[PDB]
Design a binder for this molecule. Structure first.
Ligand SMILES: CCn1nnc2c(C)c([C@@H](CC(=O)O)c3cc(C)c4c(c3)CN(C(=O)c3ccccc3)CC4)ccc21
Ligand SMILES: CCn1nnc2c(C)c([C@@H](CC(=O)O)c3cc(C)c4c(c3)CN(C(=O)c3ccccc3)CC4)ccc21
Length: 285
């Protein structure tokens, strides 16, 4: 069975946890620790392997934004380092197209990147591609029909309702329809020809609203809100349902996991993580 993996995150410090949840029976497994605890990273899968990308580490000697790429093999339960990105990218978004990892935005200190770079596993090589139109940290990324979408985030001054799409065959970005809501640190994923944006932070509060972009109509419409407001949450899709994991609600680091059913337009709470955390990377394989 496929498992939902959560890597790293934040709870009083950057975290090294790697854990996997099995939807078939509701159980959690603890797996090999990340070599370097990191919050604000992103996860993805290529070839059955989990990659942990970017983020930020806390150490007694100081806090550091990360250019790291590390790969986890579920069959050996081992992490291995990969080539680093061109720049540190904390509060990064990532998506996969044609077995290549795209690292989007994020920050390095005061620098809010608009740059984007692409990793080819077979060559362990990163190279820059065309930059986004907007600098975006805390950006949510998903892939649909071999196009890469960058949704929301923070540009250094404003949290954003804008979104843009990258066309790999043209090496160009173009804006898409803006969301109804300003969101940084939203959960962004793809289900049945729509891009969902769940929760996030607007500069004032963490959100429970959820909206989705239908790729045919190019329109964003609200669906049912999550039971718990949350920003900096993990998200993925498994067997036709969205799972949101953890995050921050302004008062606590959440352990809640909710699952959205599009046919009934309902969220339900399905499990709790073994401890509350925000800023995780999540993927399924
Ligand atoms: C700008 C770059 N960046 N990226 N990520 C950043 C993070 C994770 C922080 C940290 C601090 C740091 O590691 O330095 C951070 C950020 C916030 C917003 C809070 C806490 C810690 C610690 N909190 C608590 O325990 C808490 C929360 C609720 C109730 C009780 C305790 C308070 C909220 C700062 C800067 C970062
Ligand atoms: C404090 C008010 N607040 N609430 N939620 C907040 C969020 C989403 C942000 C954005 C950045 C922004 O809009 O500038 C943001 C976006 C992401 C993806 C991450 C963090 C921060 C920092 N990371 C954390 O684990 C984290 C998040 C919140 C609290 C503690 C740790 C890592 C990941 C800022 C500020 C916010």
């Amino acid at each position: 069975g496929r498992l939902i993996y959560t890597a790293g995150g934040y709870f009083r410090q950057s975290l090294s946890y790697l854990e996997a949840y099995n939807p078939s029976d509701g159980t959690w497994l603890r797996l090999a620790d990340l070599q370097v605890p990191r919050s604000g990273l992103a996860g993805c899968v290529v070839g059955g392997l989990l990659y942990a990308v970017g983020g930020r580490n806390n150490s007694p000697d100081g806090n550091t934004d990360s250019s790291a790429l590390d790969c986890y093999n579920p069959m050996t339960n081992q992490w291995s380092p990969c080539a680093p990105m061109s720049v540190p990218r904390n509060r990064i978004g990532v998506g996969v197209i044609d077995g290549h990892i795209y690292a989007v935005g994020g920050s390095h200190g005061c620098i809010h990147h608009n740059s984007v770079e692409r990793y080819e596993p077979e060559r362990d090589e990163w190279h820059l591609v065309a930059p986004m139109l907007t600098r975006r940290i805390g950006v949510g990324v998903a892939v649909l029909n071999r196009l890469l979408y960058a949704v929301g985030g923070f540009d250094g001054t404003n949290r954003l309702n804008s979104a843009e799409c990258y066309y790999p065959e043209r090496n160009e970005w173009r804006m898409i329809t803006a969301m109804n809501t300003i969101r940084s640190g939203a959960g962004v994923c793809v289900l049945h020809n729509c891009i969902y944006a769940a929760g996030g932070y607007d500069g004032q509060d963490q959100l429970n609203s959820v909206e989705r972009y239908d790729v045919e109509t190019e329109t964003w419409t609200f669906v049912a809100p999550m039971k718990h407001r949350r920003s900096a949450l993990g998200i993925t899709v498994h067997q036709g349902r969205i799972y949101v994991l953890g995050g921050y609600d302004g008062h606590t680091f959440l352990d809640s996991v909710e699952c959205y059913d599009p046919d009934t337009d309902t969220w339900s709470e399905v499990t709790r993580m073994t401890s509350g955390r925000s800023g995780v990377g999540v993927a399924v394989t």
